[PDB]
Structure 1
Amino acid sequence: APFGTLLGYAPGGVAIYSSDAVFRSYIDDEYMGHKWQCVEFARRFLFLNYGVVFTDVGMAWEIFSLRFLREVVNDNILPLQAFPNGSPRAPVAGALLIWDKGGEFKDTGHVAIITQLHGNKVRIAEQNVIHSPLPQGQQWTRELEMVVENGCYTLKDTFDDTTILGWMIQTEDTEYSLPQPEIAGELLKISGARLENKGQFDGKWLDEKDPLQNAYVQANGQVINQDPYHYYTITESAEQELIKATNELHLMYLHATDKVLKDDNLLALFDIPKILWPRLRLSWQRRRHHMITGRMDFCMDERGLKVYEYNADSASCHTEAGLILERWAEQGYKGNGFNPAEGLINELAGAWKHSRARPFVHIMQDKDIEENYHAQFMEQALHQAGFETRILRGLDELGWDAAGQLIDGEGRLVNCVWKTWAWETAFDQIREVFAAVPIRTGHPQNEVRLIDVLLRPEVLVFEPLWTVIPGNKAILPILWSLFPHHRYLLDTDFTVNDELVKTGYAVKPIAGRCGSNIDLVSHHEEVLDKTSGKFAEQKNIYQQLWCLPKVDGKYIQVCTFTVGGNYGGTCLRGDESLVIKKESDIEPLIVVK
């Protein structure tokens, strides 16, 4: 049958169809996958029958490496175990069956659902294998022979050149299960590289015909770093580890956020004005799927991969990674590798298209040359997604009508805004000074403040208010508490405890940014580095010391973007010091296989 024709149904009545964002398959606002791939079927099956889902993956074979499932109704996280083909642990109905990449399933690998177990066979349901209508009421696509001998179960596939990895069961019983796959240190090494110097960057290599690249130059000049002929590389294996961690930590952060918002004692730790709490909760409940983009900061090298923080509120660097660096490669890279942030623009337009933003969105940026290209970069994504826009620089163009409605300069109503401003800046206006958030709805001089916009109930804001929770460092000790000793986490606390004193630690303000007010204390007493900034008075958290690697004279940090909650790209930042700050450079990154 053609594309999308109904071929049959798997148990419980889950359709099986024959097999850029018109291909997204959703149930309510829960993403199932890309029509009509094998993963989309497996996730939809689990969603409709058991209310759980597995995290976004690039290819089906990667599913076998996952060790958790997300229970959609409460954002809970469940254990998922993996068993190798030939296991004493029988493959029960409902289990995920995973194929490694290879043969019939060349680069992708494959995934199916086991529907029934017999004595010498098993029936499974799947998408993207069978493309013809199944017979009346038959709720399985293929039967695979099973050999039970000496208590061990082995499945034999119908293709002569495939490799079945095993099956996965949602259970706490670890017996017979395999440990989580850990990447070998060496594949995570960041290494330096050089371009042949033929003078590719000895002039105006950035196109001043492009308004966007022009805005960048006006704020930075024709420069990315101290030596544009030098770049770094990472293995494709490393990129996949980054993608995995990004997708997992994002879910881990959302789970801790839910926990925080369900408990006043945990919420009090964030130092957000109490008058906002009910609103934080409302935002969490109704804008849960509305986060557009964020950035995670990681330390990556032979030692493994650890997250320092997650900039979920107002993340930048997009332009540099998804545009300036594309121009850089285009201008001087003749290699086989690729810029892992190449599709950022498109990914973002995708998020905006499936968001519930109003047709016209006002973009709010500070009157600051550096913010001009960021605001215009997002405007291009909004335009590609079909929205009309207007850029507000500063707050002077804003005023109120007689009734107290918000209007812009051309006289239109402002009811939807994407901002570059951090929510914390608005919280400051509350703390400077009631039965409600004290916002003005009229002024003799028509003086509109930041909070008078962002907290007007009728204004639809992006990023949503709840994002101040995962973007506040007070969440780190909570994440450590919920997932103690997790491979990607660093032990962090609200005090310098016994183990921390033993490991050395970083002191970081909970609502800071740009590498401000950071103190790095070695496992001795010595202060490795300390920075200044305006956040020295806020509460701090203490995070296990885990210093950036030094490669070719610079400390290099890896950053990944989330867009709509999934990996959207990678970029590097480098600094002469251990602490990355707003003025650290963007370093060209090439992923090589």
Structure 2
Amino acid sequence: HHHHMERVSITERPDWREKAHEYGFNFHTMYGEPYWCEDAYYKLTLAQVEKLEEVTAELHQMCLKVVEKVIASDELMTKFRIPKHTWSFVRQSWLTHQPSLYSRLDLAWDGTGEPKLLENNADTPTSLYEAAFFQWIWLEDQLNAGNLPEGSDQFNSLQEKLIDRFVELREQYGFQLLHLTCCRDTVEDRGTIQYLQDCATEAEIATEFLYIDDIGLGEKGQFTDLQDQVISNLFKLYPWEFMLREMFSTKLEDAGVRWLEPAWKSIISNKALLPLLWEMFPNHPNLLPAYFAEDDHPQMEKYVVKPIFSRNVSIIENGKTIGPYGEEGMIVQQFHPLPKFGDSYMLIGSWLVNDQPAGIGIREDRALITQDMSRFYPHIFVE
């Protein structure tokens, strides 16, 4: 398999599991978070990193164009499956310019051709802790042990940009006190929450963690915390796709809470994004053909049908029409295999902090069709 990036074997640091334990990083797979691996790393070039950076910034602007178009159209809000009882909540979040913290794009690329957008995890993207912090320490450690090329660098400014963004949220948007939440018995001990809380603390934001089921309902519709005090700003590791359909989700519109990620990110964190991107930016070098499966659309020789929702996938070929999952609620996307390095397919996770590209985290998986890649590998770039 010819690639312009290499997967380089390396001797694992002997104590990395305890390094994880000391930081409170549970590196085991859970809720789509990948298993940490470091018996190899990926090596990119400076040219490849500048290309990924360029493409990531532009795709994010393209996604912002999709939101404006969807927000304005009842028809498109329906096609994106935003529940009608939440349209006012979601639209007001966009029309008042509610701020974003982060996004992760998933890009298929081995350095040959153009990178292709497979999805924008713009709500609850996994592998933040590994990409921002753990692989940074890995780089410093393995440089010090003499196990990496002398000029090794890493496309990764996540921690710096996250702290700067929290400062910006505090100073210019009034995020003085930030609550953080997730569902009980999910990812509270993975590392992410504590890490983002540490970043917010460094930015001089006061923080409180509480589980989703800890949140109270006040007499005037306000959401309240473990001290029965009002929640004003709430970061969540729990997706809008679920919350907008949950019991008492009609209360969101009047709760007086500002959200990270904000409600309008629901529109770019599902697969309906991919057909709209292709319609608004036809033959864009970094997009793949995509259509709603229910629409009349060109026939593709080999393609993949994915549910609009993030809750598995099937492949079709030889110009056939649509399958166990059917047509309804599905999109279709031109089949485009991931690069194969040995026994595993590789996927590039490319991060944004608000609208600024902030680096990459690489994942692998032995299956072609997978919602969340099973394994994470650190990377470097040279030259």
Give TM-score, length-normalised by structure 1.
0.57
Match of 2:315 in 1: 520
Question: For the residues of structure 2 that align with 1:470 and 1:546, how far apart are their CA atoms?
Answer: 21
CA distance in 2, matches of 1:292, 1:190: 30
**Alignment partner of 1:548 is 2:338:** yes
Q: How far apart are the structure 2 equivalents of 1:203 and 1:282?
A: 45
Q: Which residue does 2:272 correspond to in 1?
A: 474
Shift of 1:255: 0.9
Cα distance in 2 for residues equivalent to 1:580 and 1:590? 25
Is this contact kept in 2: 1:550–1:556, CA < 8 A? yes
Mapped contact 1:365–1:420 kept (Cα < 8 A): yes
SS in 1 for 2:124: coil
- Paired with 2:220 and 2:354, the residues of 1 have a C-alpha distance of 36
Match of 1:297 in 2: 106
Alignment partner of 1:352 out of 166, 182, 201? 166
3-state secondary structure, aligned to 1:319: helix
Identify the match of residue 411 of structure 1 among 206, 225, 228.
Answer: 228
SS at structure 2 position matched to 1:354:
helix
1-structure distance, mates of 2:250, 2:28? 38
Task: Give the count of matched residue pairs.
Answer: 367
| Conserved 8 A contact 1:234-1:590 | yes
Q: CA deviation at 1:414?
A: 1.2
Tell whether the 8 Å contact from 1:218 to 1:369 is kept in structure 2 after alignment: no
User: How far apart, CA to CA, are the structure 2 residues paired with 1:296 and 1:459?
Assistant: 27
In structure 2, the CA distance between the partners of 1:414 and 1:498, relative to structure 1 (3 Å rule), is closer
Letter of the 1:347 counterpart: K
1:413-445 Cα offsets, whole Å, 9 max, x none, are 212111111011112216xx8xxx633xxxxxx
Give, as a single letter, the amino acid of the residue that structure 2 aligns with 1:310. Answer: N
Contact 1:306 1:488 in 2 (8 A): yes
How much does 1:327 deviate? 2.5
Query: Where does residue 315 of structure 1 map in the other structure?
Result: 125
Match runs of 1:492-507 below 5 Å: 492-495=290-293, 499-502=298-301, 504-507=302-305
Residue 224 of structure 1 is matched in structure 2 by 36
Deviations 1:258-283 (A, max 9, x none): 11112222222112121222332211
Partner Cα distance (2:6, 2:318) in 1:
28
Deviations 1:150-176 (A, max 9, x none): xxxxxxxxxxxxxxxxxxxxxxxxxxx
Asked if structure 2 preserves the Cα contact closer than 8 Å seen for 1:510 and 1:538, the reply is: no
Task: Determine helix, strand or coil for the equivalent of 2:36.
Answer: coil
Counterpart in the other structure of 1:337: 152
Q: CA deviation at 1:205?
A: 5.0
How far does residue 560 in structure 1 lie from its aligned partner after superposition? Answer: 0.5
Deviation of the 1:235 alpha carbon? 1.1
Q: Which has the larger radius of gyration?
A: 1
Shift of 1:492: 0.4
2:299 touches 2:319 (CA, 8 Å); kept in 1? no
Q: Give me the whole-angstrom Cα distance separating, in 2, the residues matched to 1:480 and 1:551.
A: 29
**CA distance 1:544–1:345, shift in 2 (3 Å):** same
- Tell me, in whole angstroms, the C-alpha distance in 2 between the residues paired with 1:483 and 1:585: 32
TM-score by length of 2: 0.87
AA in 1 matched with 2:199: A
What whole-Å deviation, never above 9, does each CA across 1:228-285 have from its counterpart, x for those lacking one? 2211111111111101111111111111211111222222211212122233221111
Note if contact 1:287-1:464 (Cα within 8 Å) is conserved in structure 2.
no
Where 1:193 maps in the other structure, the secondary structure is: strand
What's the CA shift for 1:377?
Answer: 1.3
The equivalent of 1:570 in structure 2 is 360
Determine which of 79, 90, 105 is the counterpart of 1:269.
79
**Equivalent residue for 1:365?**
182
Residue identity opposite 1:518 in structure 2: V
- Please tell me whether the aligned partners of residues 205 and 331 of structure 1 are also in contact (alpha carbons under 8 angstroms): no
Alignment of 1:255-266 (within 5 A): 255-266=65-76
Offset, 1:552? 2.6
Gaps of 5+ in 1: 1-185, 440-453
Query: Which amino acid in structure 2 is aligned with residue 577 of structure 1?
Result: A
Instruction: Indicate yes or no: 2:382 matched with 1:592.
Output: yes
The amino acid that maps onto 2:240 is W
**Percentage of identical aligned residues:** 25
The superposition leaves residues 493-518 of structure 1 with CA deviations (integer Å, 9 ceiling, x where unpaired) of 0138664432x111111121xxx511
SS at match of 2:19: coil
RMSD, aligned CA: 2.8
- 1:383 pairs, out of 201, 204, 220, with 201
Cα–Cα, structure 1 residues 369 and 329, in superposed 2: closer, same or farther, change >3 Å? Answer: farther
Aligned to 1:251: 61
What is the alpha-carbon distance in structure 1 between the residues aligned to residue 269 and residue 49 of structure 2? 24
Instruction: Find the counterpart in structure 1 of residue 8 from structure 2.
Output: 193
Q: Which residue of 2 is the match for residue 55 of structure 1?
A: none
In structure 2, do the counterparts of structure 1 residues 262 and 380 end up closer, same or farther at CA, with 3 Å as the change threshold?
same
3-state SS, counterpart of residue 246 of structure 2:
helix
What do residues 190-237 of structure 1 show as CA deviations (whole Å, max 9, x unaligned)?
A: 212123x3x63366451544xxx22425878xx612xx2211111111
**CA spacing shift, 1:478–1:325, aligned 2, 3 Å:** same
Structure with the higher helix share, 1 or 2: 2
Residue type matched to 2:118 in 1?
A: Y
Contact 2:345–2:368 (8 Å) recurs in 1: yes
Per-residue deviation, 1:374: 1.2
